[PDB]
Amino acid sequence: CHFSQVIFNSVEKFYIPGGDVTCHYTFTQHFIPRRKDWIGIFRVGWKTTREYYTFMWVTLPIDLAKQQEVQFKAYYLPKDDEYYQFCYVDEDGVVRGASIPFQFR
């Protein structure tokens, strides 16, 4: 009971370049999502929350646990060969989730 977190589900090992990506995530029982939380795509080994490459506001559960999702459009997604991951950054800037790494290949 030390850290309410966001758990990313069904994370692929790789995503085909040029294709849209849907990010699946669930909340722990005691995590409370807030208005300006966001799920950002970061390079692995990032150090600050401002190092995101693209982000999406959280699909705010309008009625408070179930499977959530957010769709990342291929136009905002990276095209290089680096290792990336999903990260849940809440309103206050602390990261509550970090997904398994993946590439865009």
Swiss-Prot record:
Subcellular compartments: Cytoplasm, Perinuclear region; Cytoplasm, Cytoskeleton; Cytoplasmic vesicle, Autophagosome membrane
Tissue: Expressed in all tissues tested with highest expression in skeletal muscle and lowest in brain.
Expression triggers: Treatment with IFNB1/IFN-beta and IFNG/IFN-gamma show an increase in number and size of CALCOCO2-specific dots and partial redistribution to the cytoplasm. IFNG/IFN-gamma increases gene expression only slightly and IFNB does not increase expression.
Record PTM text: (Microbial infection) Cleaved by S.pyogenes SpeB protease; leading to its degradation. Degradation by SpeB prevents autophagy, promoting to S.pyogenes intracellular replication.
Ranges that cross the membrane: none
Function summary: Xenophagy-specific receptor required for autophagy-mediated intracellular bacteria degradation. Acts as an effector protein of galectin-sensed membrane damage that restricts the proliferation of infecting pathogens such as Salmonella typhimurium upon entry into the cytosol by targeting LGALS8-associated bacteria for autophagy. Initially orchestrates bacteria targeting to autophagosomes and subsequently ensures pathogen degradation by regulating pathogen-containing autophagosome maturation.
Subunit structure as annotated in this protein's UniProt entry: Dimer. Part of a complex consisting of CALCOCO2, TAX1BP1 and MYO6. Interacts with MYO6. Interacts with GEMIN4. Interacts with ATG8 family members MAP1LC3A, MAP1LC3B, GABARAP, GABARAPL1 and GABARAPL2. Interacts with ATG8 family member MAP1LC3C. Interacts with LGALS8. Interacts with TOM1; the interaction is indirect and is mediated by MYO6, which acts as a bridge between TOM1 and CALCOCO2. Interacts with AZI2.
Family to which the UniProt record says this protein belongs: Belongs to the CALCOCO family.
Domain notes: The MYO6-binding domain is required for autophagy-mediated degradation of infecting bacteria such as Salmonella typhimurium, but not for bacteria targeting to autophagosomes. The CLIR (LC3C-interacting region) motif is required for interaction with MAP1LC3C, but dispensable for CALCOCO2-mediated autophagosome maturation.
The name this protein goes by in its record: Calcium-binding and coiled-coil domain-containing protein 2
Organism of this sequence: Homo sapiens (Human)
Gene designation: CALCOCO2
